[PDB]
């Protein structure tokens, strides 16, 4: 384990310098045909640096002239023999006191290296190379490449330098309508693929994947992967992060909440929404949607779910998981005391239906889902 703070030093922040070499006396690998970074490479490299300082306690300060720097950037074009090299991609050196430590080198004969802003592999290479120059041993979708640190990278880099708890501490939106000002978290139209692992240090946050028509599986659980915009496992939530809300697209989606209070919106299409623990607010959207409950703890009276757009005769509430302790019986207007009974109660004054479930072994009625609108017995799956 190595970092800029030494060997086997963990959770210690670092202030680092970086530099775009304008010339060299030699490249530590023995490669030759040095070429300085172009303007696009410079911009993309800074975006890559930013994606690291976003998640860990690192600061990056550019230096110029003859000042030495922790991390350097430069291109090569030829091997030690002086022959053109159009095969290799890039490499970098660990932190340390040795010559060329922290330096990173990229093959200028590769179009993706010259145009990292328009050729995604280039940006990803910058991110990986910087990762290694920071001390990561092994940094790192329909032909697309994620440009920012992924879930294991984030864990590892935070292990070395500590987690950055000042990042996006307000209410953050990831995906469409993003307010992150990060290209890798932002989708501008339905053709934009998303590949990211979200680091977020506070506030009430939303996964807005409303612009896609693919069937999506969206999971708000810390450390879990989602299938977004027709890709698979392209989105994840870093360890230590709580995302609260999620918006599906026009496809038939699955939205899985976490233990926090979640606002879930299915959008058009036939969606499956699962609030999990906590007081969730669920919008099925247009289409035939199913609201799933997996245990009594999902919607206690002290912290009940709201289903805000239920469509009688169209949507479903799924209580089949309660079978495991005796199948539920529907009662019209009164419980017997026997338990495992479900009642729908219409509040005419407010136009609210209260779904009450008296669970086996409970002295009181402890399960409640409040519904804005009417619901029928045949809307409930037991």
């Amino acid at each position: 384990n190595v970092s800029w703070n030494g060997t086997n030093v963990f959770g210690k922040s670092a202030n680092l310098t970086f530099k775009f070499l304008q010339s060299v006396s030699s490249i530590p690998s023995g490669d030759t045909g040095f070429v300085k970074f172009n303007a696009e490479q410079i911009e993309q490299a800074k975006l890559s640096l930013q994606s690291w300082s976003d998640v860990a306690n690192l600061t990056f300060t550019e230096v110029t002239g003859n000042k030495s720097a922790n991390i350097t950037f430069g291109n090569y074009t030829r091997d030690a023999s002086g022959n053109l090299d159009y095969g290799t991609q890039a490499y970098a050196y660990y932190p340390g006191n040795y010559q060329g430590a922290g330096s990173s080198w990229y093959n200028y004969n590769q179009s993706n290296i010259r145009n990292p802003g328009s050729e995604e592999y280039g940006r990803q290479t910058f991110t990986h190379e910087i990762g290694h120059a920071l001390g990561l041993a092994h940094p790192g979708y329909n032909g697309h490449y994620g440009g920012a640190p992924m879930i294991d990278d984030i864990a590892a880099i935070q292990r070395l330098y500590g987690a950055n708890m000042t990042t996006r501490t307000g209410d953050s939106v990831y995906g469409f309508n993003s307010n992150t000002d990060r290209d890798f978290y932002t989708a501008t139209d339905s053709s934009k693929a998303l590949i990211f692992s979200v680091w977020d240090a506070g506030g009430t946050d939303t996964f807005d994947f409303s612009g896609y028509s693919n069937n999506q599986r969206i999971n708000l659980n810390e450390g879990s992967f989602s299938d977004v915009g027709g890709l698979k496992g392209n989105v994840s939530i870093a360890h230590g992060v709580t995302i609260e809300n999620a918006i599906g697209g026009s496809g038939n989606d699955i939205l899985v909440g976490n233990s926090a209070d979640n606002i879930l919106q299915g959008g058009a299409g036939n969606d499956v929404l699962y609030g999990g623990a906590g007081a969730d607010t669920l919008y099925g959207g247009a289409g035939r949607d199913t609201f799933v409950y997996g245990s009594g703890q999902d919607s206690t009276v002290a912290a009940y779910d709201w289903i805000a757009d239920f469509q009688k005769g169209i949507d479903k509430i799924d209580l089949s998981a309660f079978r495991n302790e005796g199948q539920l019986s529907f009662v019209q207007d009164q419980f017997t005391g026997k338990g495992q009974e479900v009642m729908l109660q219409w509040d005419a004054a407010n136009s609210i239906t209260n779904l009450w479930l008296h669970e086996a072994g409970h002295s009181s009625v402890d399960f409640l889902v409040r519904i804005v609108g009417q619901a029928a017995q045949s809307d409930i799956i037991v």
């Binding site: 991609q89 890039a90 490499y91 970098a92 050196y93 660990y94 290694h132």
Partner: peptide, 6 residues
């Protein structure tokens, strides 16, 4: 120590 990119 060096790491290369594929």
């Amino acid at each position: 120590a060096e790491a290369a990119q594929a």
